[PDB]
Amino acid sequence: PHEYEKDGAKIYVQSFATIRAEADLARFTPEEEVVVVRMIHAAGMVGLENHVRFAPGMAIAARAALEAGAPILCDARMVSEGIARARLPAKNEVICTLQDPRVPALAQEMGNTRSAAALELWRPKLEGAVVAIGNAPTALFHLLNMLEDPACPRPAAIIGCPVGFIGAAESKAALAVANPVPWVIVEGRLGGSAITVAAVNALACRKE
Amino acid sequence: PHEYEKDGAKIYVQSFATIRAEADLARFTPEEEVVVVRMIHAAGMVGLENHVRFAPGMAIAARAALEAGAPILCDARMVSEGIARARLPAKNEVICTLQDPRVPALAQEMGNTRSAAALELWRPKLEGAVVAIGNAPTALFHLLNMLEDPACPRPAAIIGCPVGFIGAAESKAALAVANPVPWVIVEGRLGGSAITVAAVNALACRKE
């Protein structure tokens, strides 16, 4: 038959070692470097690290908020499903409101996407949250506008990594310019649910 | 506030137009070209098309099996959750057995990963299925070995797009050399749940 490596704990260690032998990671602090390594792993793409940007302190702040029990608010089900329940340090809730039966009618009334309208339902869980946006640029731009009101609850951190051709690059450059709360992004068109998940999973647990 | 495009049906049309203006797509048949466009969209990466390979007839065969009610067997929950229930043409079942409570003990006894052991549970749904492997190279290599037995039920098609540094490229090159059933792959390290989902969603419905 076909022969191949079957020890997944070994596969992980090997993957990480290969990435650290090939990637240009010197500019990242130790807390940032672990996140980057996992994002590269998820993407299968050495070179990705030339596009990542963090606010000073973000990685430290996000791991603290998770260790304190913060929820994780996700734009898409592909993000919520990816988060490793085993790695969570404090029984953290993982939330996506996209399929709430109220979202189609709210989106029509707002003249916005479903991805964006569903963020309105995050309000009660937003104070101190870790935000994970892996898909929808409209969700990230709508979140920026939400946070321009001083009465809106404010998250602990935002992982802003939407992907794509229309809106994506612009929404991530606007996040970084606005600097509402500590943030990380993948500049340009690259991003997506896998990279976003990998960032959350890296931040959640001190072990790789 | 921040200004940005809010019509998602418009966003899609624009995304696709941008990809078709930039990407090198001439070698693909019309049925293949639609799949490729959606995979690029999901990845945010023009250039991806230089890595995609299809068996002759795969795209036609996979869309037929779906129109006939075939299930969709998925390695990972990030794949199963991504598939658009609205685009499915014939009430198709979407299945992932990874979290079955029998999988941890079966994997120990097989000396294999959970991703791989969970494929044993696909047997009753495998005849005529569309296989969507977006994550685990071990699952794809284990599937090849499964199919070396003439008694194993055989799928209609395989979308083989695992990602990563260890095993991934090798498992996809082995799929293509073995040619068990019609197939598509992303050669090398790139791949993942988003690209895989996008292939299934492109095949499921004739409208873009």
Ligand SMILES: C=CC/C1=C2/N[C@@](C)([C@@H]3N=C([C@H](C)C4=C(CCC(=O)O)C(C)(C)C(=N4)/C=C4N=C1[C@@](C)(CC(=O)O)[C@@H]\4CCC(=O)O)[C@](C)(CCC(=O)O)[C@H]3CC(=O)O)[C@@](C)(CC(=O)O)[C@@H]2CCC(=O)O
């Ligand atoms: C349609 C199914 C999945 C999907 C969705 N994507 C949706 C978020 C829709 N996808 C959207 C757009 C086309 C989208 C992208 C935007 C930028 C660009 O187009 O170049 C990018 C970000 C390039 C993009 N769509 C990418 C993707 N969309 C996809 C994928 C799988 C491609 C595809 O096959 O159509 C792929 C996944 C990217 C990732 O996880 O890394 C909608 C229309 C607007 C969101 C926005 O631009 O901010 C959105 C629907 C809505 O919110 O009203 C989803 C809810 C649709 C559904 O269930 O019918 C839905 C949510 C999936 C989830 O919850 O896992």
Ligand SMILES: C=CC/C1=C2/N[C@@](C)([C@@H]3N=C([C@H](C)C4=C(CCC(=O)O)C(C)(C)C(=N4)/C=C4N=C1[C@@](C)(CC(=O)O)[C@@H]\4CCC(=O)O)[C@](C)(CCC(=O)O)[C@H]3CC(=O)O)[C@@](C)(CC(=O)O)[C@@H]2CCC(=O)O
């Ligand atoms: C740990 C959580 C998610 C995850 C998983 N990935 C797993 C599949 C584990 N991931 C695995 C490996 C490290 C893996 C990769 C293989 C190649 C390489 O490492 O370079 C690649 C393919 C590079 C890889 N892992 C990539 C990814 N794994 C991930 C991600 C999100 C990265 C991360 O944060 O660890 C990312 C997603 C890629 C995508 O969707 O496009 C295990 C250990 C082996 C599978 C194999 O190599 O064939 C696997 C566990 C097992 O089957 O025994 C998961 C079941 C673990 C869990 O729940 O504890 C689990 C399944 C996720 C799902 O059902 O959505």
